[PDB]
Design a protein around this ligand. Structure first.
Ligand SMILES: *[C@@H]1O[C@H](CO)[C@@H](O[C@@H]2O[C@H](CO)[C@@H](O)[C@H](O)[C@H]2NC(C)=O)[C@H](O)[C@H]1NC(C)=O
Lengths: 49, 53
């Protein structure tokens, strides 16, 4: 979306993806990636799924 | 010892050095001074017509 809004020319696109990747990796290096509880602990069908 | 387990102390690196990565623009106009130098020495030669005749 950012590339289309601007007028990147197939060489500044690689300069943008690099920055996005490094920033997102820096953010992802300190997050544990768990799941949010939403239902009931007793139920077996959700856990099986 | 007893129920508790003991672990060795960890050694620590004394210093760190920061060398961040930098984007490479790869511009082409720079380091083209030779072309300008070639432009400087055009050296057009013109011989007078009528002095010989
Ligand atoms: C600073 O200049 C050096 C030398 O021109 C650049 O190093 C080159 O980088 C390209 C692209 O990765 C390589 O293919 C060459 O082999 C490198 N040459 C040498 C001698 O290392 C360097 O990229 C430049 N720095 C920036 C930020 O553009």
């Amino acid at each position: 979306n950012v590339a289309n809004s601007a007028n990147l020319s197939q060489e500044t696109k690689a300069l943008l993806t690099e920055m996005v990747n490094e920033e997102m990796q820096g953010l992802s290096d300190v997050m544990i990636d768990f799941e949010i509880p939403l239902g009931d602990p007793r139920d077996q069908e959700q856990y099986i799924h | 010892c007893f129920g508790v387990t003991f672990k060795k102390p960890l050694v620590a690196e004394e210093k760190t050095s920061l060398e961040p990565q930098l984007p490479h623009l790869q511009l082409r106009l720079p380091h083209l001074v030779g072309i300008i130098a070639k432009i400087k020495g055009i050296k057009i030669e013109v011989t007078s017509s009528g002095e010989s005749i």
